[PDB]
Amino acid sequence: AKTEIALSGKSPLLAATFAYWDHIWAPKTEQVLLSDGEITFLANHTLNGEILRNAESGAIDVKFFVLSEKGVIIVSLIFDGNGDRSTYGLSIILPQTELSFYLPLHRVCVDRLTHIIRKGRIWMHKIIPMLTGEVIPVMELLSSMKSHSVPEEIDIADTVLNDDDIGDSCHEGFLLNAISSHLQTCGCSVVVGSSAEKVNKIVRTLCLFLTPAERKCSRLCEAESSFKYESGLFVQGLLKDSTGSFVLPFRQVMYAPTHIDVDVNTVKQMPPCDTLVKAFLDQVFQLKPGLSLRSTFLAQFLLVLHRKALTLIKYIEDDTQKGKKPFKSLRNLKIDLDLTAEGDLNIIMALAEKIKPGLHSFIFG
């Protein structure tokens, strides 16, 4: 029943299929390491284990298998639901040697599959067109990042830094505003660029302000294929076609929890999701970056941001008994935190969500 299909680039995926009770998808390649019946044998174990149907209304119970007996990673989300009210869910297979690659991508793969299933169950009540229609994009996003995206250990070789030039009036404003918008957008924005080297350079530059694990949650730019605004990645590079319109669905982008252009050079945070950074921008250019002395001072600002964020979380969490009372404290919170600028306050708050989600709502949302 396997429907062999192909996509550009090397294949990270090894299989993908479904489940029953009394594998139609495959990454067409050369010399698959394990035979077709092996996929079925692996699928039975993950499938034939529910028995205890303890579900109230229905949700994705994501499992995860690292089954080193053959060296295979399995991901699945089983749900109940046709003819009979049975339970069934999709599955995805990766090889053992590609272990670390998936771990950062779990939180986006689960959301994509959950949206896919939520679409399928809609058509189940009122079977295979949708199944094959929303299985390639999931197999496209993960296949693309096999040999792209910015790695964690990036030097300053291709950064906006290491330039020996502070720029003109427009360059300084553009850079400062871009960094401010990124830090105020929780670290999730994609760049639009007409050229190729310019977009790659600026993206690799702007990726220096993220955690090493976050680096694999990216998307490098290219001028060959046609990528899409994947609403689960943090920094994504792309190229705009000569039509004059970017392919950016409104619903997909808005549902995310900015726009920077190399050509017109105007950053705008049209969809939502300061002096501290101004000082860094004004001072980093006043040092010789050839001998790496400008690299070390980069880390200090990020460290001072992380610690000043953590102290705000702690001060919010001890002003109430881990949450038992309204906050009703803004002036006192602003005065003692050495942050009176609204932009600085927002920047400090932004780093908090990466550790403790929901804090925006808990404080003033």
Partner: protein, 349 residues
Amino acid sequence: TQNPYTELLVLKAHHDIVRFLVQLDDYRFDDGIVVVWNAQTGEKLLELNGHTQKITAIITFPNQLILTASADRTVIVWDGRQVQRISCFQSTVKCLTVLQRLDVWLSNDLCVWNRKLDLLCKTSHLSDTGISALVEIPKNCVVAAVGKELIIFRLVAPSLEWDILEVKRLLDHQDNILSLINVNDLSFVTGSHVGELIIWDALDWTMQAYERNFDISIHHFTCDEENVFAAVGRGLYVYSLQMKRVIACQKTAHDSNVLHVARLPNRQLISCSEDGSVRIWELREKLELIGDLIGHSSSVEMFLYFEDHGLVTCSADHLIILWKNGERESGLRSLRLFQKLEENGDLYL
């Protein structure tokens, strides 16, 4: 409040107060332990320890390694390494000086020995007391003062054998002699233990000065071709040389008794007192406080000056301090890190 010397390095390697500090070479300079140091770093390079009783003198003979004597009635010749030799005639000597032009050096009696550490000549029993001083004089002459009596034991140059005949004597002083220096080729200054100040003519050997309108135990006098400066107890008094009177006085000096004074090359005069406080002084058009240096609980013997490094000031509380300029020291520290990182590479590699 203006004033130099913002940094203060401290050294501690001695068990007794050492009163002698002698220059050795460009970069290097009472328990009988001899230690030398590095002016810039402060590292106690090498060490010399062969004495038993308290040491009495320290000099250099340019080679130019060391020459030290102690109370053990024996003079040793150390170098650095391996000691050269040791000389012991009869008694102990409290003075030693080297004659440059004559290319000879000399020691109750006076004995002059050649570069082979062999006494070329030696006088008879000069006196019951030792030689209080030994000052070089023009025309291969040696002048010494023995307490209340000063005799210029001239030395006759070498048939090629050295000779020494005393050619004069004096009794003008009514007390013991304190110190004597040769102010260029002009004259010889004389001081009395009771505080009487006198002079000695160079070739005439005729007294020409007596100042007494000042415990009066003036210790050291620092002078040059311009004017004569001396210290007595709790007041620093400058006695004019050409005009022959008292040029400058400062009654409200250090509360203790001064021990040693000197003039800095760029026209200022520093002071050392028994109270442990050393203060710099600048000569004016007929002087004022320059700075303060609070350094020890007890006295300080003498100060040695370095052209571009600083001062060495300690003898009492078993220590050594090397005062520096600071600011000028920071710049030399800056120009050795930038010039090193380029050769090294990056910061960490």
